[PDB]
Amino acid sequence: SAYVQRGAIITSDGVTLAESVKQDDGTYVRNYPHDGMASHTVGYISTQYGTAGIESSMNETLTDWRSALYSMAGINTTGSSVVLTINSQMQAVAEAALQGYSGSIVVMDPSTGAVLAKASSPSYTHAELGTSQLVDRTTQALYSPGSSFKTVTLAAGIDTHKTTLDTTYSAPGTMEIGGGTIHNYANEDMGTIPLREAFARSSNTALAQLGVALGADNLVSYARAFGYGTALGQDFSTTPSLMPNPAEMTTWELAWASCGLPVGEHASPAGPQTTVMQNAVIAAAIANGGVVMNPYIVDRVLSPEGAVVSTTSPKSLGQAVSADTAAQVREAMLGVVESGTGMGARVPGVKIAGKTGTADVENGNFNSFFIGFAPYDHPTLVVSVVIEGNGENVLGYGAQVGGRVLAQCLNIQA
Numbered sequence: 001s002a003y004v005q006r007g008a009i010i011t012s013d014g015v016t017l018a019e020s021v022k023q024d025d026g027t028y029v030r031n032y033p034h035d036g037m038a039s040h041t042v043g044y045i046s047t048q049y050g051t052a053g054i055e056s057s058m059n060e061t062l063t064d065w066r067s068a069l070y071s072m073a074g075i076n077t078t079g080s081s082v083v084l085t086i087n088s089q090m091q092a093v094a095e096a097a098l099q100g101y102s103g104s105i106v107v108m109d110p111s112t113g114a115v116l117a118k119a120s121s122p123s124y125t126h127a128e129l130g131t132s133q134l135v136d137r138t139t140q141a142l143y144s145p146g147s148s149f150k151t152v153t154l155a156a157g158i159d160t161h162k163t164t165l166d167t168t169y170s171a172p173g174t175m176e177i178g179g180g181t182i183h184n185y186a187n188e189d190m191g192t193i194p195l196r197e198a199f200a201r202s203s204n205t206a207l208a209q210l211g212v213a214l215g216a217d218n219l220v221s222y223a224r225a226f227g228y229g230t231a232l233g234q235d236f237s238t239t240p241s242l243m244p245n246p247a248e249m250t251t252w253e254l255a256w257a258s259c260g261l262p263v264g265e266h267a268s269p270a271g272p273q274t275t276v277m278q279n280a281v282i283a284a285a286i287a288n289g290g291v292v293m294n295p296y297i298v299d300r301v302l303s304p305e306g307a308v309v310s311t312t313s314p315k316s317l318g319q320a321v322s323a324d325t326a327a328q329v330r331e332a333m334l335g336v337v338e339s340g341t342g343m344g345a346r347v348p349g350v351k352i353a354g355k356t357g358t359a360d361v362e363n364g365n366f367n368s369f370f371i372g373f374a375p376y377d378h379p380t381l382v383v384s385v386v387i388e389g390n391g392e393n394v395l396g397y398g399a400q401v402g403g404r405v406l407a408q409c410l411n412i413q414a
């Protein structure tokens with residue numbers, strides 16, 4: 001079977017990232033041009049390091065008594081190739097934006113869930129497998145989403161008709177909720193302000209009240225309608241994002257969960273805990289009139305004849321919030337970037353909307369998050385980013401990175 005030629009893995013814009021080369025021996029050596037590009041996505045079949053990506057998720061596609069003879073094991077056959085949805089140019093954009101940081105970025109089409117760029121850092125080359133990096137931080141690492149999760153809280157509060165963007169909230173520096181103390185960043189007392197402004201400035205005190213008003217059943221149900229609990233990806237592996245069993249939640253737990261911090265202590269997992277990919281699916285469903293799409297990364301499969309054997313169809317995971325709700329959420333996210341905590345994602349000449357977040361992790365470090373879309377009117381791309389601080393002060397980086405990736409990718413599209 002080592003005399004059987006495996007198919008190629010190609011990008012949407014025709015860049016071959018994996019291919020088989022017949023050696024004088026007869027056997028084929030798996031080669032990888034542009035080694036280092038989209039490593040986690042392209043993947044590998046390694047005794048030592050395991051399996052990952054397309055090499056393994058499309059393994060069988062890539063892989064008479066003519067069958068006995070090893071000498072004819074090639075004349076008879078060749079494996080079918082896989083054309084990804086990844087666009088090599090957008091992929092380089094994301095990879096360059098991650099240089100010198102650990103974290104990840106996903107760029108997707110909101111109307112279909114097609115993943116156009118997917119990158120994790122640090123990365124590696126296939127050549128190195130011959131000798132942290134291996135974790136795919138887009139899909140197989142979980143993180144506290146922090147305030148990026150407030151997009152869900154907000155969408156739920158509006159969709160259930162429990163609040164509006166102009167409804168005022170008290171946003172004090174600290175407040176006591178269910179026996180515990182919720183606090184705004186730097187205990188900033190913002191006074192009484194509309195929900196749009198609490199969202200823009202990312203007040204934990206205000207969003208925690210929305211959380212408590214919604215209740216645990218509503219917060220979980222809406223998180224799940226956005227994809228939590230699903231192994232996202234029609235043709236790639238994502239670890240499901242997690243929420244607790246609502247019945248086990250406490251009011252304080254619910255308060256922080258509504259701001260993206262998981263503090264639960266119970267049999268079911270603490271939440272929320274998200275993947276970067278799940279964050280993208282939320283941004284996309286909001287940009288997409290509330291319709292959630294199951295992301296995908298294979299466009300089509302080709303026979304060795306350079307012929308189309310199948311094409312992926314975009315598929316919905318359901319409608320998480322109504323169109324009217326999504327339009328209000330989009331307007332709120334535009335405010336974050338225009339006058340709130342996401343001002344760093346602004347790029348002159350383009351209109352960008354999103355939501356930021358920052359979350360403390362182990363050893364006093366923190367992570368920076370950004371989800372968003374562009375252009376504001378008729379969005380054609382969505383971005384999700386995490387920049388892990390790991391000692392460095394990365395406050396605001398997710399948003400700077402997100403806006404720049406969005407703008408560059410839009411130019412690529414033009």
Ligand SMILES: *C(=O)[C@@H](NC(=O)Cc1ccccc1)[C@@H]1N[C@@H](C(=O)O)C(C)(C)S1
Pocket residue numbers: 145146147148184185201202203204259260341356357358359360366396
């Ligand atoms: C949501 O992410 C909130 N984050 C925090 O309150 C905790 C935190 C942890 C480390 C450093 C700073 C804050 C609020 N939203 C973020 C954000 O939008 O990035 C703020 C930093 C604005 S506070």
